[PDB]
């Protein structure tokens, strides 16, 4: 189960955040800053995996803004990368040529996609087109 997901920019600004653990706001704010500092202080050949406080923090940035996750030390690590790639593909397909501008302005759509795709740190839909159809049906309802 993914403890949290944080879409952060290369400049350090966070564009998305979804934590599955009930933590205090000051603690959450400190954790986010520490994750940004650790990820922002890492090279391009660090394996995209960090064990921060017994949690395999995996980072795989496909653009200037990066992505991060926090999986428990009981599952595979490449599965997190595959889930991140699937989520990126779903986000690109739902909007169409997803870029940085559409993420800050359309964060509400990203949150809804994340909710309809991953719930509770676990996955909700293994496919990539059924989720798109469900999101389109939910949005077209008005």
């Amino acid at each position: 189960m993914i403890h949290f997901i944080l879409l952060f920019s290369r400049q350090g600004k966070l564009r998305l955040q979804k934590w599955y653990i009930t933590l205090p706001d000051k603690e959450r704010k400190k954790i986010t800053r520490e994750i940004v500092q650790i990820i922002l202080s890492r090279g391009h050949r660090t394996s995209s995996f960090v064990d921060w406080k017994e949690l395999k923090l995996v980072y795989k940035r496909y653009a200037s803004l990066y992505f991060c996750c926090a999986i428990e030390n009981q599952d595979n690590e490449l599965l997190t990368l595959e889930i991140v790639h699937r989520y990126v593909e779903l986000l690109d397909k739902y909007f169409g040529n997803v870029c940085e501008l559409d993420i800050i302005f359309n964060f509400e759509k990203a949150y809804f996609i994340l909710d309809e795709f991953i719930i509770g740190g676990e996955i909700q839909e293994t496919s990539k087109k059924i989720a798109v159809k469900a999101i389109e049906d939910s949005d077209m309802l008005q």
């Binding site: 653009a63 200037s64 986000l91 690109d92 870029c99 501008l101």
Partner: peptide
Amino acid sequence: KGENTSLLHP
């Protein structure tokens, strides 16, 4: 800029 670039370029 660096933000208008696509995420995966598909």
